[PDB]
Design a protein around this nucleic acid. Structure first.
Ligand SMILES: [Mg+2]
Ligand SMILES: [Mg+2]
Ligand SMILES: [Mg+2]
Ligand SMILES: [Mg+2]
Ligand SMILES: [Mg+2]
Ligand SMILES: [Mg+2]
Ligand SMILES: [Mg+2]
Ligand SMILES: [Mg+2]
Ligand SMILES: [Mg+2]
Ligand SMILES: [Mg+2]
Ligand SMILES: [Mg+2]
Ligand SMILES: [Mg+2]
Ligand SMILES: [Mg+2]
Ligand SMILES: [Mg+2]
Ligand SMILES: [Mg+2]
Ligand SMILES: [Mg+2]
Ligand SMILES: [Mg+2]
Ligand SMILES: [Mg+2]
Ligand SMILES: [Mg+2]
Ligand SMILES: [Mg+2]
Ligand SMILES: [Mg+2]
Ligand SMILES: [Mg+2]
Ligand SMILES: [Mg+2]
Ligand SMILES: [Mg+2]
Ligand SMILES: [Mg+2]
Ligand SMILES: [Mg+2]
Ligand SMILES: [Mg+2]
Ligand SMILES: [Mg+2]
Ligand SMILES: [Mg+2]
Ligand SMILES: [Mg+2]
Ligand SMILES: [Mg+2]
Ligand SMILES: [Mg+2]
Ligand SMILES: [Mg+2]
Ligand SMILES: [Mg+2]
Ligand SMILES: [Mg+2]
Ligand SMILES: [Mg+2]
Ligand SMILES: [Mg+2]
Ligand SMILES: [Mg+2]
Ligand SMILES: [Mg+2]
Ligand SMILES: [Mg+2]
Ligand SMILES: [Mg+2]
Ligand SMILES: [Mg+2]
Ligand SMILES: [Mg+2]
Ligand SMILES: [Mg+2]
Ligand SMILES: [Mg+2]
Ligand SMILES: [Mg+2]
Ligand SMILES: [Mg+2]
Ligand SMILES: [Mg+2]
Ligand SMILES: [Mg+2]
Ligand SMILES: [Mg+2]
Ligand SMILES: [Mg+2]
Lengths: 93, 46, 271
RNA sequence: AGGACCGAACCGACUAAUGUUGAAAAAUUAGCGGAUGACUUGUGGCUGGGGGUGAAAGGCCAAUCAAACCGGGAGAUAGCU
RNA sequence: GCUCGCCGGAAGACCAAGGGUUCCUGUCCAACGUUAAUCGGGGCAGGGUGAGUCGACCCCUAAGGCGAGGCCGAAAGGCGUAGUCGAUGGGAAACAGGUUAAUAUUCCUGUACUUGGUGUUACUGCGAAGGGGGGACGGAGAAGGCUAUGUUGGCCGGGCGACGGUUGUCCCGGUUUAAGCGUGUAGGCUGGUUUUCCAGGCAAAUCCGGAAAAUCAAGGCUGAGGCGUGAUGACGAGGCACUACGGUGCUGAAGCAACAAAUGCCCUGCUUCCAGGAAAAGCCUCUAAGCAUCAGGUAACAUCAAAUCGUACCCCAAACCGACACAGGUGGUCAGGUAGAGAAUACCAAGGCGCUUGAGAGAACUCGGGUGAAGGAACUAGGCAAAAUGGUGCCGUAACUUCGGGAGAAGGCACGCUGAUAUGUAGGUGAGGUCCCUCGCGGAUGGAGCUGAAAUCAGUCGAAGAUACCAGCUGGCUGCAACUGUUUAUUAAAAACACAGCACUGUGCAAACACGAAAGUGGACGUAUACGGUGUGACGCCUGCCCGGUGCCGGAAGGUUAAUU
């Protein structure tokens, strides 16, 4: 049983894009930005508690930040992790 | 023509990496010199 | 036994091979095998310390019993086998209690023969006794040098040792080199000559045959530059030097034995 | 069967022409040698500088080798320009 | 968009290394792109990488590394035991279809499988840091059985032709389906079973090893492919309805057989040879201490879990190594048609490209090619370069020889197409039918159908039938090195080096010798039929005289002679 503090930390933001909306309206999946070190189980528990929905499975991937060019100097955006969490076909957040 | 630098990350790390430098007295001297000079990258690992 | 190849190619014209139809054709006895990787003549410093070694066929080590210490239990020879690690052949023997073991194959031994060790063994080829119990004049092989240590003399194919004299705690032996030596009478020996005597009749026939045995080419010192060998240098073929080794020691007749610890056992040098 | 034969891949490099501020700090084109073996190749490992390694050419050791490269003695010394 | 050309054992498609956003969308054209640029691997913004089964991680080890104590060393350190790391090797498990602008064995649909934890029932001797088995292994060769795959015929849908003919022996297209599950075949290996005993496997063992009896002869293990199911599905030519013209939706016929056939699979097999061919764990089994109606084990069922990291894109290349968008280099996998021995070569398929300056003109000269009267090496240092030869089958072939060779010696003849032999032969494959049995993926006959050379005879066209591409010049005398190899990366490939063979010499094992202040290590887990050094260099006939000089070996009477005293 994961403590509530960790659950309150793991979820960062919902991800907005064409693929995300298509996944929502097709496969009943929401796409989230999660903490870099969140595991699948923590994401599952956090979504189940903070959104009071039931989840089938969580798929995660790590996105690598883009090297950018800003006025003579090279900067790099930070890596982040996003999760494809599938709802249990009857919740419809 | 086959040139001299044939890259390989495993060999690079095993020959010049941080843990290879730290393994000997002379490698630690290398690290100390590079810290004294102010190098931004001590070893090839970074 | 010894057969010449037909000269169907220049690399075959001079090959003489030694074939034994009696050798086992299957795989060796697994429980008595180990690995021995090649060295290339390199020591633990990583440096060539013996030149002209390298490559060759992969080989597995056969644990050969050189001690022959389990006494009183007769054994029967199962089969003769080829051994890559030595010039002699080895024989698999099965003891009456169910234990299997490799021994050097003496001349005349064949499958089904009985062998036995100990002080009370019959005087027959392949039997091992302390040299105190062996009649003077016998030819023996696999001779121990210190009691209980294991045979060290007369182990190569076709070799043997003669027992020439016995007095007190010592026996005088005539070694294959023609050299007479004392050993303690309690050291063990095996009766008869070690087999495969025609080993020396083979002719390799080509350079590749030597490469198959892990021998690398020898460059004559006179073909080098002076920085490489004392013999090097010259415009054309020049020698004008006393022959020496790559490290400067004279190499035609100069004696190199210097061991005062064991001089007391040498009755007469080989000469 | 074979360090057998002819011949692609593959490994080489005998001849000629081109190129020589090159397409290339060693190649291209047409021919050429080996092509089951002392073969060839991937990955990893070991040998360190008066030292290694060398089927031996003073060859090779990161486009550097009759003694590598980097830093230091060091502003060596220079009856020479 | 239409036409043209080029690659097609790659200039197509994947993977590993290496790179790191180059991927896709919108937008911009200053600089970058050897020109313009509306375009881009360029600028700016946004988007994109989804795993119990793929890989890493993980378990196990190789070479090798590090190394508690230890041994050794002025110091720094060197070596190494127990250990612990280290893949390029061993170890559980997933397939087909659909889908995005960009991911997919990861998402969705269908159908599977593996390991482990808990719980419950049933029955029970469980237990390792130990024992045994297994894992577990070479080169070459030879088939036989198959499949991938292809071709043809059936079947299905469509067609009836811009110019003579084309309702037919005509044309175009399709004719696909996996893992898993059941069956246990071609074939490979091995006798089986039950008792008793035992100096062995560090102790024990019911396991392995060994011995002795009895009995039965058929039992076990492995095994491609086929067949059935998976699959009343999915896919499917095409048709229809739309289009925001890129494409979206709907529907959907046939979906068979024969023959040929791998370098792939059975096969880690079989045969043979000598140069005699990893390790450890997972796995199976045996017990020790120990536990003892407990624990544990086995089986069935239920449930839970399978984390983390990688996943875009390039990958014979404009993205990697070469300073470049550089004619160079870069490991593995896939492998269609016609001809062909072929992965050569020519033309093509799938697929991908026209190489990031063009437009004219048609001088010398340079480069790469084509042809050439008469002559034919007169050229030149030299036939350098070029020209020529070139295939298959058959005939035929010298000196010399180490009897193998030389030898593809040299030289010569035939070669296309059509018909017949023979409406397609010899051969290969093989259905139905019939007969059997221990009835089966069975055995014997049987020959339908399919496929199908080579040869002979006759005819026939051309200047020419190995018509293109492809594809030996040959012979004679002689020096050198026996030969296959190796070498001056980048002006020298040789007569140089190596070599098998020969000889001398050292070396008795704590070997000589080499690396090392040393400990140690190699030599070698070898033992004089072995190992080191040196010279010569297959083979044949041979290898003469000199010990004065210089080395080396032996001797020790005498002369001389150090430290020491
Ligand atoms: Mg999933
Ligand atoms: Mg993932
Ligand atoms: Mg030698
Ligand atoms: Mg020699
Ligand atoms: Mg020379
Ligand atoms: Mg010298
Ligand atoms: Mg001379
Ligand atoms: Mg002279
Ligand atoms: Mg050959
Ligand atoms: Mg070379
Ligand atoms: Mg070429
Ligand atoms: Mg060839
Ligand atoms: Mg020279
Ligand atoms: Mg160089
Ligand atoms: Mg110097
Ligand atoms: Mg000074
Ligand atoms: Mg100066
Ligand atoms: Mg073409
Ligand atoms: Mg960028
Ligand atoms: Mg793009
Ligand atoms: Mg403009
Ligand atoms: Mg421009
Ligand atoms: Mg861009
Ligand atoms: Mg180790
Ligand atoms: Mg160590
Ligand atoms: Mg210590
Ligand atoms: Mg480990
Ligand atoms: Mg691996
Ligand atoms: Mg893609
Ligand atoms: Mg088939
Ligand atoms: Mg991809
Ligand atoms: Mg370009
Ligand atoms: Mg290029
Ligand atoms: Mg290559
Ligand atoms: Mg081709
Ligand atoms: Mg012109
Ligand atoms: Mg011209
Ligand atoms: Mg011409
Ligand atoms: Mg002419
Ligand atoms: Mg003419
Ligand atoms: Mg003429
Ligand atoms: Mg002339
Ligand atoms: Mg002239
Ligand atoms: Mg020529
Ligand atoms: Mg020509
Ligand atoms: Mg002459
Ligand atoms: Mg030669
Ligand atoms: Mg050169
Ligand atoms: Mg050259
Ligand atoms: Mg030793
Ligand atoms: Mg010579």
């Amino acid at each position: 049983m994961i403590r509530e503090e960790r659950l309150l930390k793991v979820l960062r933001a919902p991800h907005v894009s064409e693929k995300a909306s298509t996944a929502m309206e097709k496969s009943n999946t929401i796409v989230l930005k999660v903490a870099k070190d969140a595991t699948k189980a923590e994401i599952k528990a956090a979504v189940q508690k903070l959104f009071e929905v039931e989840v089938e499975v969580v798929n995660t991937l790590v996105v690598k930040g883009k090297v950018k060019r800003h006025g003579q100097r090279i900067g790099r955006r930070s890596d982040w992790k996003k999760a494809y969490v599938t709802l249990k076909e009857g919740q419809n957040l | 023509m086959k040139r001299t630098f044939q890259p390989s990350v495993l060999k690079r790390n095993r020959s010049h990496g941080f843990r290879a430098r730290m393994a000997t007295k002379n490698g630690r001297q290398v690290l100390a010199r590079r810290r004294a000079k102010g190098r931004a990258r001590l070893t090839v690992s970074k | 036994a010894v057969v010449k190849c037909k000269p169907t190619s220049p690399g075959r014209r001079h090959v003489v091979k030694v074939v034994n139809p009696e050798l086992h054709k299957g795989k060796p006895f697994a429980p008595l095998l180990e690995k021995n990787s090649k060295s290339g003549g390199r020591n633990n410093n990583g440096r060539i310390t013996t030149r002209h070694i390298g490559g060759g066929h992969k080989q597995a080590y056969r644990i050969v019993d050189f001690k022959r210490n389990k006494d009183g239990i007769p054994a029967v020879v199962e089969r003769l086998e080829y051994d890559p690690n030595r010039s002699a052949n080895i024989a698999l023997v099965l003891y009456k209690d169910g234990e299997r073991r490799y021994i050097l194959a003496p001349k005349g031994l064949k499958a089904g023969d009985q062998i036995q060790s100990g002080v009370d063994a019959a005087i027959k080829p392949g039997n091992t006794l302390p040299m105190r119990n062996i009649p003077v004049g016998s030819t023996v092989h696999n001779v121990e040098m210190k009691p209980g240590k294991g045979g060290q003399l007369a182990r190569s194919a076709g070799t043997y040792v003669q027992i020439v004299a016995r007095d007190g705690a010592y026996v005088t032996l005539r070694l294959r080199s023609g050299e007479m030596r004392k050993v303690e009478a309690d050291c063990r020996a095996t009766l008869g000559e070690v087999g495969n005597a025609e080993h020396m009749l083979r002719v390799l026939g080509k350079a590749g045959a030597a490469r198959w045995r892990g021998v690398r080419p020898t460059v004559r010192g006179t073909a080098m530059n002076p920085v490489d060998h004392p013999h090097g240098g010259g415009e054309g073929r020049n020698f004008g030097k006393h022959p020496v080794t790559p490290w400067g020691v004279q190499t035609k007749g100069k004696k190199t034995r210097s061991n005062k610890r064991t001089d007391k056992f040498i009755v007469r040098r080989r000469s």
